[PDB]
């Protein structure tokens, strides 16, 4: 499904992303916006046999298993299909594990380029959450 900006922010707050390991809620809402326009079904094929899945475009090369990606590590120990659900539970759990590595949110290029070091709070501003 395609989340509304505030709707996703509230769901993300509920799923404990606000201040998770120091990342305020804005960072996540912003990353989602630039990664998939808040679309849980977003999909993207890469030059290699990997595909990015979900609202946070998580890669099947390192994070999830789709059963047809060469060199799959499945770090999140989850089927990639679980990252396309309207229920963001899986995408958030995996995102939390990704950001728990040394390079935090720098795992999401879109975040660095279009969110890192900006007034990220502006993304949840206006939302009654």
């Amino acid at each position: 499904k395609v989340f509304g900006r505030c709707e996703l922010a509230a769901a993300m707050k509920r799923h404990g992303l606000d201040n998770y390991r120091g990342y305020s809620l804005g960072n996540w809402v912003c990353a989602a916006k630039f990664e998939s326009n808040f679309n849980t079904q977003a999909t993207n094929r890469n030059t290699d046999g990997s595909t990015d899945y979900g609202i946070l475009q998580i890669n099947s090369r390192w994070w999830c298993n789709d059963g047809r990606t060469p060199g799959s590590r499945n770090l999140c120990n989850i089927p990639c299909s679980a990252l396309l659900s309207s229920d963001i539970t899986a995408s958030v759990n995996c995102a939390k594990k990704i950001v728990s590595d040394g390079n935090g949110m720098n795992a999401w290029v879109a975040w660095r380029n279009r969110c890192k070091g900006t007034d990220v709070q502006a993304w949840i501003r206006g939302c009654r959450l």
Partner: antibody
Amino acid sequence: EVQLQESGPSLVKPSQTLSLTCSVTGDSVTSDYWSWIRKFPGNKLEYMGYISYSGSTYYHPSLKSRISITRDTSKNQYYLQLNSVTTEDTATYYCASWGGDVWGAGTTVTVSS
Amino acid sequence: DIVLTQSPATLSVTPGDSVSLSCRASQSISNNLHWYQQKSHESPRLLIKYASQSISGIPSRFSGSGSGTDFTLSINSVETEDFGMYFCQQSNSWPYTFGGGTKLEIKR
């Protein structure tokens, strides 16, 4: 199924170094984050630290400096080194996946001269 | 460091009774609270992750609730194999920390 097993000296002398090995079977040590957790005699638990995919480590500050966590991809194991121990480092040590879904049986290390 | 306080320190029940174990955090941790069971002579076992998410393979009598700083682990109809220690652990901020634990013991 993934399985973990700790091993190493059960006795370390004060001021010396404590070393433990965690053998990973079932999956690659490069395909998950790995941690070390210790349970003191009183039964309290302390999350010592973990090593993630990039090789980056996070160490507990109330310990930090003395601890080092490393891994060996060819042997599919990861390790724990804790320098300058004192009797207070006596505890049951466990290796576990970052997710907490898998734990070793644990191994007791006693610090005594 | 985030401090987690569990209560009661100990609880004596009769198999068949239901129980609720509390864990409170010194700072809000949203839903980043996990529950472990640890029997004597055994390693910890993850029962609930992220405050309320069920773990496939864990008995349905175990459930968790709460958010922010107030959490609860419920066991509806405690069974004879459920006695032991129960700890909560937060993963919201480093260093990860554990509560002091609650001991579930048999009533007689």
